Amino acid sequence: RKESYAIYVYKVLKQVHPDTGISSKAMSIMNSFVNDVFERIAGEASRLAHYNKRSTITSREIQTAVRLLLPGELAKHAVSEGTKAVTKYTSA
Amino acid sequence: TRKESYAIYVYKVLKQVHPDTGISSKAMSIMNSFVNDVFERIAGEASRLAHYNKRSTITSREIQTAVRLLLPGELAKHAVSEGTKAVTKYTSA
Amino acid sequence: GEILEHICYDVNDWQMLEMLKPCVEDGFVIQDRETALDFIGRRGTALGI
Amino acid sequence: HRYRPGTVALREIRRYQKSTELLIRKLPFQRLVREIAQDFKTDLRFQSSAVMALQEASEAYLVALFEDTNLCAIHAKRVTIMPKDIQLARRIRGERA
Amino acid sequence: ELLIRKLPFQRLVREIAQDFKTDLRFQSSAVMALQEASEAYLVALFEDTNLCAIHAKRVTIMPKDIQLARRIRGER
Amino acid sequence: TRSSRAGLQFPVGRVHRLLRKGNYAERVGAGAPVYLAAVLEYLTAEILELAGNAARDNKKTRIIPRHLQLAVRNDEELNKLLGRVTIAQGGVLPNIQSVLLPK
Amino acid sequence: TRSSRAGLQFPVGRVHRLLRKGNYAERVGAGAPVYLAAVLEYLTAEILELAGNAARDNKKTRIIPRHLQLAVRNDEELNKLLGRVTIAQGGVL
Amino acid sequence: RDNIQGITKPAIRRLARRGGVKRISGLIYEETRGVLKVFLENVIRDAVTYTEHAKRKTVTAMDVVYALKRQGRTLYGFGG
Amino acid sequence: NIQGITKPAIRRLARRGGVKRISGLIYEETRGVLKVFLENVIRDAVTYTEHAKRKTVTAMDVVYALKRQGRTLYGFGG
DNA sequence: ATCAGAATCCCGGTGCCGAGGCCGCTCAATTGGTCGTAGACAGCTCTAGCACCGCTTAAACGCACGTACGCGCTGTCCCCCGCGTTTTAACCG
DNA sequence: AAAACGCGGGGGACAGCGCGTACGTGCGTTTAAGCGGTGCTAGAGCTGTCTACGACCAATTGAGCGGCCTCGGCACCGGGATTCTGAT
């Protein structure tokens, strides 16, 4: 039983560069990349919560984690749209 | 207040290994931070290993593998040996 | 050695110690008086601490 | 015509940055990894994907090390690379246990 | 004893933190940790730089030496 | 679907699963997985952008590991965000030392 | 006390408590804390022994940053274990 | 003067002598201030992020230690 | 039998590395450095297998041994 | 300054394998509700690390001097390139 | 298809030798800085109340995974044009 970010990478690519595709091995690289970034961000959020005596990984913990992993030219735009997603989720 | 530190225990080990020598507040802090770092590292390794083996529990064999990966070598055997004596003597009683 | 002396009085008579070897081999799991009383306690099992 | 020493060397450099396929010879690397794991556990077992991952991380190591070695020679007004260059590259890197 | 010089280091740290935040208020232990870490980094880097000079057949370290050390470390 | 209702393209439910079974904290907030999905989505989109542009500049309509390698390394920043990462079967940027040229 | 019955100087019980409270896994084996305390005790004993030896070589009854750092850096074993680590107020080899 | 120049030429000198440098070039000092500058920017950035998350208006030695530990040089002595 | 990693192989890897000239002793020293790196990664890999109880190193165990030394590999699972 | 001789490069032809689509029905998703309790919030006491000023004095700055070494230039001669040729280990059905 | 030997050959290593910028080294100044000492008061760090938040649990279903199946597209080839390169 395998679990992967296949259709999601496909959906992003077909949303933004419709004329391109993603090979099987390129997909494997991309799956590893998404899993790795997820592990780093989530591990940092967990460490932040442990430091702060926090038993919940909230959007604020993920905020701090992304702002503290991605060092410059990232986590300005990424944070803005992340907050946009959380906000309009709460609206909807 | 109750402070989270390995003060008395490091004192006990130091008197066992060198009864005459003592350790001060700062050096106790060095030892405490070092032990916390090593312990955090081993526990993180054990949890990661249990995860990658899809095992949702931690145990002496998890810590076996963690210690063996982390400690570079020629204390790996010693750490394994003393940990094993501790765990067999535990499982007896 | 005190135990084996209390058992086999004649040290030259090795046979008793030889037949005792499994006993002291398997009884090493306790090496202190308090622990031994406590082991009789674990087998007593009288909801004790 | 006899090619002067150096131009084909640049040519191989350019060719091997353009290319991407692996470059350490794969069956010799299979034998090397097999006999190196033998000393760590008798009756041990490898698969193709695992050997490929080892060979490929190995190639990454050696290209990075040769970046450092070349660059160290260039800093030392040296175009060749020498064992001292490799040792320096490694011992600044910290892998010299 | 410590050699990167106390109050100059503290003020340098203060203006560095000023850019990242305002009314930011350090701790003495925090300043000590910062100075000790920077000391360790710089002693390591000068060790590397002297390796670089000694390999280039030079006794005096140089700009190129320290840049070599850095771009083999990787932060550069 | 929380992915739709949060306007994302990545799986809110799946990142919630993974945050659970990773044992990252005793509890997980409602908004955290959505934010993490958004961050992962956008990093995905941007690295794929660089890859697609590399492919077009290679006159070539397919993402292969070399294209991902150039997409990572050519950017001055992602090169060192993935500096400890080794992309498989991606070569190296074609750089040559200026002194190491015929002159 | 679990430590006192264990004949290890480190708190098995508090190590278990932190392993539970550290989100490391939902359940923790009985022997894992014991093994971890044993390895922590062993590493602390080794480092403290080396520090005391350095203090004796320096003709000092007091174990100071320079003693601990000098031990860790002279000894190749601990040196490779804590190579990318810095000891506060610690001098150069 | 500006406090980047607070790290004095003798301080750079003593650092170099500890690390084993026999001689220091006059061009060394500016760049040592530069590398010190960038490293402090990094570590203070992570520390300030830690405080901002903590709703704490005071950088803490634990925050500095955590920042250094992520950058790859764990600092012992100020643990808590 | 260390010669499997041959002189042209080290040569070409250096040319991928941008090297223009290679001293003769680079080949032997390079094989040695390769051996050291291989020991370092195989030790962690076989440790992970002994954890799994299996005999066969999985690509996952490879990736995890490699991620232990701070050199993450991408493509071989995740 | 010039053009011959290798390598690199353009196009397009044919073959094969994997990408991307489709299909089913598996599994976990998604409401819907309930309960407990973690955090937000409010409020208090008390820490501690500002801001500066003494005062002594170690340390830093500036300047001047002398000479050990950086960089350049030249020369010789070891040590590789760069083929061509001959083994050789490997190639994938 | 690649590795391995062998030969002549060019290029560059390595050493030596000179000169001069740059360096370290005093010489004391001026500088600033421990290491005290002042008065804060920001803002902890801690407790207690109570709410919304989140964790579990059925019940319902629709996104994902594996299997299956096409055919664009890439690698491949020969042949043809491009090209940067001394060589004299």
Q: Where are the domains of chain H?
A: 1-80
A66/A49 Cα distance (integer angstroms): 14
Q: Chains that contact B by 3+ CB pairs under 8 Å? A: C, F, G, H, I
Asked if A67 and H66 come within 8 Å (Cβ–Cβ), the reply is: no
Q: Å between D83 CA and J93 C1'?
A: 43
The number of domains in chain G is 1
Phi, psi of G28 (to 5 degrees): -120, 135
E66/E51 Cα distance (integer angstroms): 10
Which H or E run contains C8? none
Asked if I71 and F96 come within 8 Å (Cβ–Cβ), the reply is: no
Degrees, nearest 5: CA angle B56-F1-F40: 65
3-state secondary structure F10-76: CCHHHHHHHHHHCCCCCEECCHHHHHHHHHHHHHHHHHHHHHHHHHHHCCCCCECHHHHHHHHHHCC
Asked if D10 and F102 come within 8 Å (Cβ–Cβ), the reply is: yes
Amino acid D93 reads R
Q: Which residues of H touch G85 (CB under 8 A)?
A: 73-74, 76
Q: Which residues of A touch I72 (CB under 8 A)?
A: 36
User: Residue A15: which of F9, F18, F43 has the nearest Cβ?
Assistant: F9
Indicate the resolution in Å. 2.9
Looking up tokens 């990984």, which residue turns up? A57
Chain A residues whose C-beta is within 8 A of a chain I C-beta are: 25, 28-29, 31-36
Looking up tokens 């007896």, which residue turns up? B92
Looking up tokens 């030889």, which residue turns up? C18
A35/I75 Cα distance (integer angstroms): 11
The HSE-up count of residue A8 (CA atoms within 13 Å, CB side) is 26
Give the CA distances from residue B20 to residues B29, C14, E22, G60, in Å, rounded to whole numbers and listed in that order. 20, 45, 51, 12
Question: What's the burial of H26, exposed, middle or buried (CB within 10 Å: 0-12/13-18/19+)?
Answer: exposed
Are E70 and H64 in contact by the 8 Å Cβ rule? The answer is no
F98/G85 Cα distance (integer angstroms): 37
Are B87 and G35 in contact by the 8 Å Cβ rule? The answer is yes
- Strands I72-74, F85-87: pairing kind: parallel
Are I71 and I55 in contact by the 8 Å Cβ rule? The answer is no
Amino acid H60 reads T
Degrees, nearest 5: CA angle D63-E69-H76: 105
D75/E61 Cα distance (integer angstroms): 12
Asked if D91 and E57 come within 8 Å (Cβ–Cβ), the reply is: no
Domain that holds residue G6: 1-93
For D1-97, the fitting CATH number among 2.60.40.420, 1.10.20.10, 3.40.50.300, 3.10.105.10 is 1.10.20.10
**In this structure, what token pair is assigned to residue A68?**
């503290």
E58/H23 Cα distance (integer angstroms): 9
CB-CB neighbours of B57 under 10 Å: 12
The number of domains in chain A is 1
Task: Tell how far CA F86 is from the center of its chain.
Answer: 13
User: Residue F94: which of D14, D21, D57 has the nearest Cβ?
Assistant: D14
Alpha helices for G1-93 (secondary structure H) = 2-6, 12-21, 31-57, 65-74, 76-81
Domain I1-78 has what CATH class? mainly alpha
Which H or E run contains B86? helix B76-92
Are I46 and B68 in contact by the 8 Å Cβ rule? The answer is no
C47/B62 Cα distance (integer angstroms): 33
Are F29 and F16 in contact by the 8 Å Cβ rule? The answer is no
Whether F73 sits with its Cβ under 7 A from any strand J atom: the answer reads: no
D36/D30 Cα distance (integer angstroms): 10
**D–F interface: beta-carbon pairs under 8 A:** 42
Are F93 and D17 in contact by the 8 Å Cβ rule? The answer is yes
Give contacts of G 26-55 with F, CB under 8 A: 26
- Strands F27-28, F85-87: pairing kind: unpaired
Rg over alpha carbons for chain I, rounded to the nearest Å, is 15
At residue I16, the 3 state secondary structure works out as helix
Q: Which residues of G touch A46 (CB under 8 A)?
A: 23
Are E31 and E10 in contact by the 8 Å Cβ rule? The answer is yes
I47/B81 Cα distance (integer angstroms): 17
Rg over alpha carbons for chain A, rounded to the nearest Å, is 16
Q: Which residues of D touch E72 (CB under 8 A)?
A: 68, 71-72, 89, 92-93
Nearest CA in chain H to G87: H76
Are F85 and I67 in contact by the 8 Å Cβ rule? The answer is no
- Strands H74-76, F27-28: pairing kind: unpaired
Whether A43 sits with its Cβ under 7 A from any strand J atom: the answer reads: no
D57/I40 Cα distance (integer angstroms): 12
Are G55 and G63 in contact by the 8 Å Cβ rule? The answer is yes
Q: At what angle do helices F31-57 and F65-74 cross, to 10 degrees?
A: 100
Q: From the candidates E46, E62, E72, which should be mutated to test the interface with D, based on the most D CB atoms within 10 A?
A: E72
Give the CA distances from residue H61 to residues E55, F56, H67, in Å, rounded to whole numbers and listed in that order. 39, 50, 10
E75/I77 Cα distance (integer angstroms): 28
Amino acid D31 reads R
A33/F78 Cα distance (integer angstroms): 12
Chains A and I touch (3+ CB pairs under 8 A): yes
CATH number for the domain that contains residue B65:
1.10.20.10
Question: What's the burial of H3, exposed, middle or buried (CB within 10 Å: 0-12/13-18/19+)?
Answer: middle
CB-CB neighbours of D76 under 10 Å: 21
Phi, psi of G8 (to 5 degrees): -105, 150
Looking up tokens 């087998």, which residue turns up? C43
Q: Å between D78 CA and K13 C1'?
A: 9
Q: Which residues of H touch A63 (CB under 8 A)?
A: 53
Q: At what angle do helices F12-21 and A24-51 cross, to 10 degrees?
A: 60
Q: At what angle do helices G65-74 and B25-52 cross, to 10 degrees?
A: 40
Nucleotide nearest to D76 (CA to C1'): K13
Residue H41 β-bridge partners: none
Q: Which residues of B touch H78 (CB under 8 A)?
A: 29, 33
Q: Which residues of D touch G80 (CB under 8 A)?
A: 97
**In this structure, what token pair is assigned to residue D72?**
């160290």
Q: Å between B77 CA and J10 C1'?
A: 64
Residue with minimal CA–C1' distance to J30 is F1
Looking up tokens 């003798």, which residue turns up? H10
Nucleotide nearest to A27 (CA to C1'): J19
Please provide the size of chain F in residues. 103
Q: Does I55 contact chain A (CB < 8 Å)?
A: no
Q: Å between H67 CA and J46 C1'?
A: 29
Q: Å between A50 CA and K46 C1'?
A: 19
Residue with minimal CA–C1' distance to K53 is F29
* Residue B41 CB contacts under 8 Å (≥ 6 apart), including other chains: B70
Give the CA distances from residue F41 to residues A80, C8, G30, in Å, rounded to whole numbers and listed in that order. 13, 80, 41
F62/F55 Cα distance (integer angstroms): 6
A23/A13 Cα distance (integer angstroms): 12
Whether E22 sits with its Cβ under 7 A from any strand J atom: the answer reads: no
Please provide the size of chain C in residues. 49
Are H58 and E25 in contact by the 8 Å Cβ rule? The answer is yes
**In this structure, what token pair is assigned to residue F71?**
């997409």
Closest CA to E38 of H10, B34, H11, G68: H11
D22/H75 Cα distance (integer angstroms): 41
Question: Long-range contacts made by residues F67-71, C-beta under 8 angstroms, separation at least 24?
Answer: F67/A26, F68/A26, F68/A29, F68/A30, F69/D20, F71/F47
**CA torsion, points B35, B37, B40, B45, in degrees to nearest 10?**
-110
Fold observed for domain H1-80: Histone, subunit A (1.10.20)
Q: Does D22 contact chain I (CB < 8 Å)?
A: no
Degrees, nearest 5: CA angle I57-I59-I64: 90
**In this structure, what token pair is assigned to residue C31?**
């090496």
DSSP E strands in chain I: the ranges are: 72-74
Whether H21 sits with its Cβ under 7 A from any strand J atom: the answer reads: no
Domain E1-76 has what CATH class? mainly alpha
Domain that holds residue A8: 1-91
Chains A and H touch (3+ CB pairs under 8 A): yes
Sign of the CA dihedral with F83 first, then F86, F90, and F92 last: positive
Nearest CA in chain H to A44: H70
Are I41 and I65 in contact by the 8 Å Cβ rule? The answer is yes
Nucleotide nearest to F64 (CA to C1'): K74
